[PDB]
Design a protein around this ligand. Structure first.
Ligand SMILES: CCCCCCCCCCCCCCCCCC(=O)OC[C@H](COP(=O)([O-])OCC(O)COP(=O)([O-])OC[C@@H](COC(=O)CCCCCCCCCCCCCCCCC)OC(=O)CCCCCCCCCCCCCCCCC)OC(=O)CCCCCCCCCCCCCCCCC
Ligand code: BCL
Ligand SMILES: CCCCCCCCCCCCCCCCCC(=O)OC[C@H](COP(=O)([O-])OCC[N+](C)(C)C)OC(=O)CCCCCCCCCCCCCCCCC
Ligand SMILES: CCCCCCCCCCCCCCCCCC(=O)OC[C@H](COP(=O)([O-])OCC[N+](C)(C)C)OC(=O)CCCCCCCCCCCCCCCCC
Ligand SMILES: CCCCCCCCCCCCCCCCCC(=O)OC[C@H](COP(=O)([O-])OCC[N+](C)(C)C)OC(=O)CCCCCCCCCCCCCCCCC
Ligand SMILES: COC(C)(C)C/C=C/C(C)=C/C=C/C(C)=C/C=C/C(C)=C/C=C/C=C(C)/C=C/C=C(\C)CC/C=C(\C)CCC=C(C)C
Ligand SMILES: COC(C)(C)C/C=C/C(C)=C/C=C/C(C)=C/C=C/C(C)=C/C=C/C=C(C)/C=C/C=C(\C)CC/C=C(\C)CCC=C(C)C
Ligand SMILES: COC(C)(C)C/C=C/C(C)=C/C=C/C(C)=C/C=C/C(C)=C/C=C/C=C(C)/C=C/C=C(\C)CC/C=C(\C)CCC=C(C)C
Ligand SMILES: COC(C)(C)C/C=C/C(C)=C/C=C/C(C)=C/C=C/C(C)=C/C=C/C=C(C)/C=C/C=C(\C)CC/C=C(\C)CCC=C(C)C
Ligand SMILES: COC(C)(C)C/C=C/C(C)=C/C=C/C(C)=C/C=C/C(C)=C/C=C/C=C(C)/C=C/C=C(\C)CC/C=C(\C)CCC=C(C)C
Ligand SMILES: COC(C)(C)C/C=C/C(C)=C/C=C/C(C)=C/C=C/C(C)=C/C=C/C=C(C)/C=C/C=C(\C)CC/C=C(\C)CCC=C(C)C
Ligand SMILES: COC(C)(C)C/C=C/C(C)=C/C=C/C(C)=C/C=C/C(C)=C/C=C\C=C(C)\C=C\C=C(/C)CC/C=C(\C)CCC=C(C)C
Ligand SMILES: [Fe+2]
Lengths: 43, 258, 307, 281, 55, 55, 42, 54, 43, 53, 42, 54, 53, 43
């Protein structure tokens, strides 16, 4: 709790944005891998 | 550009090597001028500026802003000895030694010389006194090696002139600087840790003889030592190496004795 | 047969010094480590704390991955055999790609491709650390002398591994990652370029490398000689010239005619060492790109008896 | 010709030889008995180098080379034109060096400072005497020494280095090179640190020794201290020279084959000399 | 895995994000260099062979 | 096993997670590079031979 | 308690860590299963 | 995506901007240099062969 | 929270300008990539 | 027995760190020894079994 | 004693530590069983 | 645009020094690359065009 | 006997650490000696016995 | 009698625990040696 000084609501909001970026980063990554697998599959 | 020469054998490698000689000549000039911020202008053996000052001119002055509000120091600047030098010219022609007029160790000349530093204790980064006795030091203790406290203090004449009582410690560097040697008269002198050799059972001070231990300059405050007091103590003890040679019983001292 | 101040004859162990706090973010600073008596005989016994910021993390991550990548290739070259790993530890090598591939990144992963990856990690590791030296000095408000003294080292380091290979148009000219390999690379460098001794800039770097040993032996002995006057506290001698600074000045003035100051001697110190790599980078950079044989270059410039 | 503070330290005594016979200053230099020997050996050594240029038939300073006597003469005298001059210069150089160290000793005693400087210089002299005296005597020929030329004493290094393959594999050499690199690294760090603490950002106060320790503790997590770094500087330089003197005194005397061949002992250790895989087998 | 947000009650966001950006960039370069290492998947060479850019 | 949460009373979570994060990535890199090193399990080379990408 | 955390905080910290651990293990099991089908190593 | 502004509540803009500027320049140099390394995509050599400057 | 010391209004203003620069920078790059792909495509 | 008292003597932080380092290095050392040998090199033997080469 | 742990703390610390030790050794035994079946070393 | 606010974040003095050094170094680098290529070596181009070489 | 008094003279922390290092190093030294010999290398023994090579 | 500051009764209990581990450790060693001798005797 006291290691960062943030509250639960701040952490909840901070995590929500962080996961929002993470899913955006993940979604672009998935689209990118599909493009490679369609153009040149590695399996 | 392999083998591409502008003229003669001069090429890109030749371009660089000569351009460095110009740079190195310029750099040596710059370095030498910086070294001329202390002890200059030169002076005659009497105290007047000499007709010779050197091929390198003096640099433009620069200012050092001292820590802890001690002021500023602009060099090169007018530098004065600020103490009477008890020396006598031994020859009208220059480049000859000056002999002491009286006792050189007491007069602070030659190897026993000292400088009129600021008469204040040296401070750490936090403003506290850098050098304090281990008794007044918070938590300091002997961690390794033979503890010199309580050991007899033997001079260069192989005679005990007291015993160690306290150790002075440089608080930031956390290393011992002085040994507080109590004499037979009840007073305690300071001996630099660099001038003593803590043996198995005794503190051998090769610099000073037993009778000269009383002559060490004393400190104004038992809890702190100023820069001026350090120079007088360090000068006096180190001056003992040449000025107590007749009193030293060492074989090599006898061979090098006059 | 007296006390020469080479090793401390007594140690005192007070509380750990946490250091100054001019502009240093104490959150990024760690705690104090142990006290080493073995280190205390020579210098300070306290280890730590160490600051770890953003550039500190990037330096460590790339530095670890650089160290790790060399290690994995060292294990692969050992066949994953710990006995073989210790036997051929110095003989292992992460060689750069073959000369055929030039500067192309098409080298196979086991034929030079891995070296490019490891070299990238070192590149990021060192440059991030240079900024770390810069920012640590800036945080305490000190001069950037370390940052630019470091940049001299980077110049030679950049030349050997990055700049000279680009000009030569081949990664094969770079340095392998190994104990004996980068020694062999050094020897093969001179032989290919015709007795690198006759490189004028290599000779200058040896002059300053010899001079750095000369100046530090001179400077270290001088301060230990005048340490009996408290001459080791050089910063106070710069501020308030004591008798140690004067005697140190006079010893060299009476020995070799000229002297320096307590602050000006360290200007000689920094420039003596900086030119070691500064002239070194130019000396290596010219080799191959400008001079394909230094002894032939030496002959045409009056350094060898022939021609 | 005197500094603003030089006068109070100019006192008699401290001389090893001569007393006040040579105890005087020529300009800034202090003469002493050993300085007279210094000047004579220095001047005589320099002139014979110049005279050796006349005999050689060249005036280019880089082409000037005082070669030592050929291997046929062994460790005896040689004609001055074909090795004899080198022996005289080496004797003059040896005399000049030792007289210089002993002159520094006199200046040490006059100032009351330690003898670290002449002791440090004596390490260089024994390094010098290793190459010109100790190694050639063991090998029984002055020709194994190096010529007194700017670019011909490099030929000696290259030729002697390649006599034993790649000389990098000399184990004493690796120790000394690590010391030489470490010393230059320490000097750059030490020089830069004090200047950073003494010439800080404009307007900011001159820094204290605590900032010096704080900087290097924030950098590499350990500060060796003002006393330690100067001890480190002295020991790093002397160790580099000591191992450099050691590396040559064992080469051609105890080890004769390629130095890379030496390192096979580690590979040929009993418990892994025969394991397959790796670099060696 | 709702309680995951608690990670920020212990981790400092500045340290994590710097580590995150450093990690992903170094990882991304390593993979791209690995792909360029293999003769296949070297997308700067398969197109060269496809269009016969280089003889 | 139900008292394993007591480990967080002894170990700092910040120190552990940094230690674990470095450990897990370095382990994952070590395993992945081992597979690439072997003639088999070098999945990039496997698919190249499978799809006749050698030429 | 060296860390200074209370038992309830540790119970919460463990619950998140174990939830993360099982998710990490769950993906790893699928990864190992997928590789074993594609190329078994036993 | 619509709440990313809070990064500037956490990160100092001075440090981020310098880091981004260095990153973008270094990355741009890397890619431009990677293309020049290969015989293909060396647009200097491409035009040289196109117009037969040799 | 609030390590930077900025205000939420200032943070929104700073991000608004920052994204404006980002879209300008990305817009040039997209045009740059499109021109290069037309001139010489890597697919 | 009464082995729990070893924790009165040994600091739990130091031991667990030392043990964690010890166990991993032991696990790594054992796994590498098996990988070194042509037998038990489970990657090599599976390739031989399925004729990967 | 040296560590300042109470005897109840030592017993609790040892109890969970041995729980981990037997859990670790249990997987190790299963691991050695699987390897011996797949490829015995005796 | 409100790009003027970057000068509230960045010190103009340091930025202008960075721009000058970077632009100069970049300008030298491209010119040196062009001279390195046998094509675009305008010294050699003029020599061939007017038959300076003889 | 009175061997319990050896703990009145030795620091239990240092002895246990030294003993822990000593036993592990001794165990490693013995295990390596067995592997060094052509016999008792249980990895080699199984391979010859079960015809792995 | 006071080199380590350990009480005499504390030493007795510490040694009792230590010997208990020593016999437990040696008991497994004997079982280990017994199996090896059965599997491959060295005499
Ligand atoms: C003590 C150190 C003394 C240095 C000794 C240098 C030397 O031996 O030169 C011999 C030189 C004559 O040698 P040379 O082979 O017959 O060359 C004749 C012509 O120089 C050139 O006639 P050349 O064509 O037949 O010889 C080719 C070559 C070789 O010619 C040389 O000898 C060059 C010597 C340059 C000496 C450095 C001059 C420094 C001037 C500043 C003082 O000359 C060149 O290609 C040009 C090299 C110099 C370019 C310098 C341009 C940048 C100067 C910036 C400073 O005699 C001198 O001039 C020495 C002067 C020393 C004064 C003290
Ligand atoms: C047969 C071999 C050749 C020869 C070939 C070369 C070659 C080739 C080179 C030198 C170079 C040097 N040579 Mg030569 N050299 C020979 C003979 C000699 C002799 C002699 C008496 O014979 C001497 C004294 C020297 C002396 C020297 C040095 C002056 C110089 C290296 C400076 C330095 O510090 O580099 C070492 C320092 C660096 C490379 C800088 C490293 C900086 C980076 C930032 C450090 C990063 C650290 C990294 C991340 C690791 C971190 C680890 C963790 C901290 C644990 N050479 C012969 C003729 N020599 C170099 C030079 O500059 O020549 C002009 C060079 O490239
Ligand atoms: C950077 C490191 C460079 C190393 C290479 C050069 C080292 C020698 C530098 C010599 C020097 O500066 O000497 C000046 C000195 C000048 O000193 P001086 O004896 O003329 O008197 C001092 C001169 N003033 C008063 C102007 C300071 O040269 C000599 O004394 C003779 C040195 C012969 C070489
Ligand atoms: C002391 C020097 C130590 C460091 C040497 C670095 C390399 C210096 C040489 C170099 O670059 O030469 C080529 C360059 C360029 O070569 P260059 O060909 O332009 O000029 C040389 C002229 N000829 C061909 C006639 C020889 O030379 C120079 O720039 C001249 C440097 C001369 C230095 C001579 C020192 C003499 C010392 C006294 C004599 C002692 C003899 C014993
Ligand atoms: C190669 C190694 C060379 C080593 C040389 C070391 C020389 C050390 C000289 C020590 C002199 C000590 C002494 O008392 O000598 C008395 C005498 C000189 O005595 P003095 O009369 O000058 O008095 C010395 C005492 N003072 C000055 C304080 C009054 O030494 C000599 O005979 C001269 C030394 C000969 C040097 C030989 C060189 C060959
Ligand atoms: C050798 O091995 C090879 C290379 C062959 C194969 C590699 C294998 C390995 C080891 C691969 C490893 C992969 C891993 C571990 C990948 C991990 C990826 C992760 C975790 C990515 C996460 C990305 C997250 C992103 C991009 C999130 C961004 C978030 C934002 C931009 C928004 C943040 C803003 C906030 C929190 C606002 C601040 C809040 C307040 C209240 C002020
Ligand atoms: C050479 O040997 C080879 C390489 C051949 C074979 C390898 C051998 C070896 C030595 C293998 C070793 C394997 C090991 C030791 C594996 C261990 C794996 C473990 C322990 C993995 C753990 C993973 C845990 C994860 C991913 C947990 C993630 C958790 C989160 C993302 C949430 C974190 C947030 C928290 C806890 C919030 C805190 C809450 C409060 C209330 C404060
Ligand atoms: C080896 O691998 C290769 C190189 C082959 C392939 C490469 C792989 C990798 C690892 C690629 C990585 C790519 C990445 C990470 C790209 C990232 C790009 C980004 C995020 C670029 C962002 C650019 C943003 C810019 C240029 C923003 C500019 C903003 C301005 C000019 C305005 C700033 C002014 C402001 C905020 C004033 C307002 C201030 C106040 C106080 C209100
Ligand atoms: C060359 O030799 C070769 C390699 C060929 C053969 C090998 C030879 C040798 C020398 C082998 C050596 C083997 C050894 C020494 C093995 C030792 C294994 C041991 C002792 C393992 C212990 C494992 C214990 C574990 C995993 C414990 C885990 C515990 C937890 C996860 C819970 C921790 C939490 C606690 C204690 C909470 C604290 C409680 C409170 C109330 C605060
Ligand atoms: C090359 O030569 C070859 C190898 C071929 C042949 C070898 C030749 C030679 C020269 C061999 C050398 C032999 C020697 C000199 C052997 C010496 C053996 C000795 C001195 C053995 C002594 C052993 C003593 C022991 C094990 C004592 C153990 C003591 C205890 C278990 C109890 C200690 C605890 C105490 C005292 C508690 C403290 C008491 C109180 C009241 C607090
Ligand atoms: C070249 O030679 C070869 C390798 C060929 C053959 C080898 C030869 C040699 C020289 C072999 C050497 C053998 C030796 C010297 C073996 C010695 C073994 C011993 C003495 C082992 C002792 C083991 C003791 C153990 C495992 C004790 C464990 C105890 C505990 C886990 C409990 C500790 C907890 C305590 C005391 C709680 C504290 C209590 C209180 C009341 C505070
Ligand atoms: C068991 O051990 C483990 C596995 C745990 C870890 C052990 C690791 C080991 C044993 C590591 C050993 C490391 C060694 C022996 C390192 C030696 C390094 C040496 C001697 C280096 C010497 C010279 C290196 C130089 C000059 C390198 C310069 C590199 C650069 C300037 C970077 C160049 C940048 C490039 C090529 C970027 C290319 C990439 C792109 C994307 C453009
Ligand atoms: Fe210094």
């Amino acid at each position: 709790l006291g290691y960062t000084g943030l509250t639960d609501e701040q952490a909840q909001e901070l995590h929500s944005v962080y996961m929002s970026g993470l899913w955006l980063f993940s979604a672009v990554a998935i689209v990118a891998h599909l493009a490679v697998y369609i153009w040149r599959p590695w399996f | 550009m392999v083998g591409v020469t502008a003229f003669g054998n001069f090429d890109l490698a030749s371009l660089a090597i000569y351009s460095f000689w110009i740079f190195l000549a310029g750099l040596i000039y710059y370095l030498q001028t910086e070294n001329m911020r202390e002890g200059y202008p030169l002076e005659n053996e009497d105290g007047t500026p000499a007709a010779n000052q050197g091929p390198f001119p003096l640099p433009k002055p620069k200012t050092f802003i001292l820590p802890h509000g001690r002021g500023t120091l602009t060099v090169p600047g007018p530098e004065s000895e600020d103490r009477p030098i008890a020396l006598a010219r031994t020859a009208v022609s220059e480049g000859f030694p000056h002999a002491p007029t009286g006792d050189p160790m007491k007069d602070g000349v030659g190897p026993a010389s000292w400088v009129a530093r600021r008469d204040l204790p040296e401070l750490d980064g936090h403003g506290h006194n850098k050098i304090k006795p281990m008794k007044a030091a918070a938590g300091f203790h002997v961690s390794a090696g033979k503890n010199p406290i309580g050991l007899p203090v033997r001079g260069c004449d192989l005679e005990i002139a007291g015993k160690v009582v306290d150790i002075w410690v440089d608080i930031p560097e956390q290393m011992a600087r002085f040994l507080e040697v109590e004499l037979k008269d009840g007073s305690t002198r300071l001996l630099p840790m660099q001038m003593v050799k803590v043996q198995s059972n005794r503190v051998h001070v090769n610099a000073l003889s037993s009778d000269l231990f009383a002559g060490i300059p004393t400190i104004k405050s038992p809890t702190e030592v100023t820069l001026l007091e350090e120079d007088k103590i360090c000068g006096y003890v180190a001056g003992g190496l040449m000025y107590a040679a007749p009193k030293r019983k060492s074989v090599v001292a006898a061979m090098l004795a006059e | 047969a007296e006390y020469q101040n080479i090793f401390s004859q007594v140690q005192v162990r007070g509380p750990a010094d946490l250091g100054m706090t001019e502009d240093v973010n104490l959150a990024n600073r760690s705690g104090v480590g142990p006290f080493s008596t073995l280190l205390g005989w020579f210098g300070n016994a306290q280890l730590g704390p160490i600051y770890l910021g953003s550039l500190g993390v990037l330096s460590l991550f790339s530095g670890l991955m650089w160290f790790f990548t060399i290690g994995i290739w060292f294990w692969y070259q050992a066949g994953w055999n710990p006995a073989v790993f210790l036997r051929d530890l110095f003989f292992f090598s992460l060689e750069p790609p073959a000369p055929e591939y030039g500067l192309s990144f098409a080298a196979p992963l086991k034929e030079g491709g891995l070296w490019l990856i490891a070299s990238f990690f070192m590149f990021v590791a060192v440059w991030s650390w240079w900024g770390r030296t810069y920012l640590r000095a800036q945080a305490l408000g000190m001069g950037k002398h370390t940052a630019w003294a470091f940049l001299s080292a980077i110049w030679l380091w950049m030349v050997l591994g990055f700049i000279r290979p680009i000009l030569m148009g081949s990664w094969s000219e770079a340095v392998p990652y190994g104990i004996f390999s980068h020694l062999d690379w050094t020897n093969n460098f001179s032989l290919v370029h015709g007795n690198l001794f006759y490189n004028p800039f290599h000779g200058l770097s040896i002059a300053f490398l010899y001079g750095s040993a000369l100046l530090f032996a001179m400077h270290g002995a001088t301060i230990l000689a005048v340490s009996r006057f408290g001459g080791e506290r050089e910063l106070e001698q710069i501020a308030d010239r004591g008798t140690a600074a004067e005697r140190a000045a006079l010893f060299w003035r009476w020995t070799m005619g000229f002297n320096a100051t307590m602050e000006g001697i360290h200007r000689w110190a920094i420039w003596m060492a900086v030119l070691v790599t500064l002239t070194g980078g130019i000396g290596i950079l010219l080799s191959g790109t400008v001079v394909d044989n230094w002894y032939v270059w030496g002959q045409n410039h009056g350094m060898a008896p022939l021609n | 010709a005197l500094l603003s503070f030089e006068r109070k330290y100019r006192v008699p005594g401290g001389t090893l030889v001569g007393g006040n016979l040579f105890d005087f200053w020529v300009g800034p230099f202090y003469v002493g008995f050993f300085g007279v020997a210094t000047f004579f050996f220095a001047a005589l050594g320099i002139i014979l180098i110049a005279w050796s240029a006349v005999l050689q038939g060249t005036w280019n300073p880089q082409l000037i080379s005082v070669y030592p006597p050929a291997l046929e003469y062994g460790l005896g005298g040689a004609p001055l034109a074909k090795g004899g001059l080198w022996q005289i210069i080496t004797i003059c150089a040896t005399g000049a060096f030792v007289s210089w160290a002993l002159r520094e000793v006199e200046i040490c005693r006059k100032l009351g400072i330690g003898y670290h400087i002449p002791f440090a210089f004596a390490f260089a002299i024994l390094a010098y005497l290793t190459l010109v005296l100790f190694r050639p005597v063991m090998m029984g020929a002055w020709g194994y020494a190096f010529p007194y030329g700017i670019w011909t004493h490099l030929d000696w290094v290259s030729n002697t280095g390649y006599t034993y393959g790649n000389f990098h594999y000399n184990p004493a050499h690796m120790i000394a090179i690590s010391f030489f690199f470490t010393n230059a690294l320490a000097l750059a760090l030490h020089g830069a640190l004090v200047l950073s603490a003494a010439n800080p950002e404009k307007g900011k106060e001159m820094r204290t020794p605590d900032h010096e320790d704080t900087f290097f503790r924030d950098l590499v997590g350990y500060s060796i201290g003002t006393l330690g770094i100067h001890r480190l500087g002295l020991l790093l330089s002397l160790s580099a020279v000591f191992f450099s003197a050691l590396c040559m005194i064992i080469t051609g005397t105890i080890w004769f084959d390629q130095w890379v061949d030496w390192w096979q002992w580690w590979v040929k250790l009993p418990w892994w000399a025969n394991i397959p895989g790796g670099i060696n087998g | 895995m709702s309680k995951f947000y608690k990670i920020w009650m212990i981790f400092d966001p500045r340290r994590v994000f710097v580590a995150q950006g450093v990690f992903l960039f170094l990882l991304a370069v390593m993979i791209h260099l690995i792909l360029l290492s293999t003769p296949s998947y070297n997308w700067l060479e398969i197109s060269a062979a496809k269009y016969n850019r280089v003889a």
